[PDB]
């Protein structure tokens, strides 16, 4: 079992704060990276970085570099992104994806999260 | 010298072994005079995830 | 972003095909070119990753090439199981993933 345990569903106001949760289990969290993907309900998928429990450095696309930061917490073997302003743009189902090699950060996953959505309101 | 190592990973550290540790992390010259001690500690330096 | 062809025609038994284009850095530049596949409403798991080869657990009748500036995945004796979206991707560079607009296999 590798299945990653997402958070639920939030709601929030225009321009306001959102945190999402990947609560990893069964595999090693340290080692394998842990991207994050956006897929808009209308429309696609797109990528916005990564963070990993080695080492804890974040890197992002240009579109989202500043508007969003990424954590991690070995604690209780989850990683957080979290982001600055909830644009309707932005209303998406948010998947946290496991990168299916080992310390690199080569760029295709694996295992995918359950599916936390997100949605601005009016 | 101390340090924490895998379980498997405990016959690298000796004279002309090979590998991740004994390359890379802590190696042993083949000119080697001393002992090496080793324990498991299992119950005592690991916890559940 | 990669572009891409929008749809794809079939029926079960047959074949079809699904392609990503671009070549300035783009899937046609490196060798990380992964597929990923989609059903509506689940997420998604890579059936075809660095250029050409499967994942354990993918069925052998997918395929992948970059076939030059581009790239190709194919699905042979289609059945029910194999209608969804099909994305590619690629590394372009710098850190910086960008996937393709996705195909949506569609069988008769
Ligand atoms: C993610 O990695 C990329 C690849 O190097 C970084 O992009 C470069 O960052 C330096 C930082 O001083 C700039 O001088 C370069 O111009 C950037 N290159 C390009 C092509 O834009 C990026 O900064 C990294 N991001 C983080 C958060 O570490």
């Known amino acids: 079992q590798v299945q990653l345990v997402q958070s639920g569903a939030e709601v929030k106001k225009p321009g306001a704060s959102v945190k999402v949760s990947c609560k990893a289990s069964?595999?090693?969290?340290?080692?394998?990276?842990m991207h994050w993907v956006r897929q808009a309900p209308g429309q696609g998928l797109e990528w916005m970085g990564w963070?990993?429990?080695?080492?804890?450095?974040?890197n992002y696309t240009q579109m989202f570099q500043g508007r969003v930061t990424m954590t991690r917490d070995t604690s209780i073997s989850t990683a957080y992104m979290e982001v600055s302003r909830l644009r309707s743009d932005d209303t998406a189902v948010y998947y946290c994806?496991?990168?299916?090699?080992?310390?690199?950060?080569?760029?295709?996953?694996?295992?995918w999260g359950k599916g936390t959505t997100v949605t601005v309101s009016s | 010298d101390s340090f924490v190592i895998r379980g498997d990973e405990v016959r690298q550290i000796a004279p002309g072994q090979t590998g991740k540790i004994a390359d890379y992390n802590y190696k042993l010259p083949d000119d080697f005079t001393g002992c090496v001690i080793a324990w498991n500690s299992n119950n005592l330096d690991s916890k559940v995830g | 972003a990669l572009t891409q062809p929008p749809s794809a025609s079939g029926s079960p038994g047959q074949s079809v095909t699904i392609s990503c284009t671009g070549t300035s850095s783009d899937v046609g530049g490196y060798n990380y070119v992964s597929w990923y596949q989609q059903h509506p409403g689940k997420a998604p798991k890579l059936m075809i990753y660095?250029?050409?080869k499967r994942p354990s657990g993918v069925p052998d009748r997918f395929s992948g090439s970059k076939s030059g500036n581009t790239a190709s995945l194919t699905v042979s004796g289609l059945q029910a199981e194999d209608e969804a979206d099909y994305y590619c991707?690629?590394?372009?560079?710098?850190?910086?993933?960008?996937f393709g607009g996705g195909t949506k296999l569609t069988v008769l």
């Open positions: 069964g595999y090693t969290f340290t080692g394998y990276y």
């Open positions: 660095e250029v050409s």
């Open positions: 994806a496991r990168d299916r090699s080992w310390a690199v950060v080569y760029y295709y996953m694996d295992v």
């Open positions: 963070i990993n429990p080695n080492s804890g450095g974040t």
């Open positions: 991707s690629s590394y372009a560079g710098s850190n910086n993933l960008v």
